[PDB]
Amino acid sequence: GIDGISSNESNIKIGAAANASHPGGVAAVSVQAAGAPYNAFTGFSSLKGLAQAFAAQGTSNTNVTVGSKTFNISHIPVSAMPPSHSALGNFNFGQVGTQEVYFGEWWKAGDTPASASHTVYYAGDNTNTTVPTAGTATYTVAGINGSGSNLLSGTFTANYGAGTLEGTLTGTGTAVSSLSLDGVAFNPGTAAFAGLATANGTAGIDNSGVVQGQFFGANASALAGIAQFDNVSYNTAFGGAKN
């Protein structure tokens, strides 16, 4: 019941954890090089709890309002964590409201989001997903790009009948200051989309973006995805709530 992608499965895998309330499982992430239990699939919900549990030492878990929508953001830096959790790595990830939709990034202890280990991912429950075949909807979108405190944000427009997803995000303190979808599309009535993207920011314009994501929930109440660029500083994960 869980779908999702990781830009680098040698660092991060996305998958399902068993749960008494979800026969298809709950969204989870596995850190390939971490100590137990974090090398198994760990529910994002448990990582949310860890971010709360270590908040006095530098982690955080915050409800952030974007437009009229809430995104729950978890920030887990290696510097805030005990030494045996060094191999757990650095996390920034968000949840689309209380929907079972997560999106975020990771990088290795001692690296930065500019390093090759900068990995982006999304994960979500597909059990109830239905995608309209006609009409249009907009989504309030938040994006994570090397920060848990300065989110990308903007509006994506889904044209369900044409099968297109369009829009632009901007940032106020991340590597990426603007990111535009280019030709991102999906078969009408189906959940998965993909296309290209262009970003601008601290390293200049980068037209090499590749976008992959999907709709989630009844009547496509959410979306999430990732964008990868030749410059991994610009690698971005995003999640949207249907307006």
Numbering used by the authors: 22 to 264
Authors' account:
HphA is composed of a C-terminal 8-stranded β-barrel packed against an N-terminal clamp-like structure through 6 intermediate β-strands. Once secreted, HphA has the dual capacity of binding hemoglobin and scavenging heme. HphA along with its cognate receptor, HphR, function together as a two-component receptor required for full virulence and facilitating extrapulmonary dissemination and/or survival in the blood.
The resulting apo protein is devoid of heme and refolds to its native conformation as indicated by the absence of a Soret signature in the UV–Vis spectra and X-ray crystal structures. All apo HphA chains adopt an open conformation and do not show structural heterogeneity in the heme-binding region. The loop containing H43 then dissociates from Hb and clamps down on heme in a relatively slower binding step.
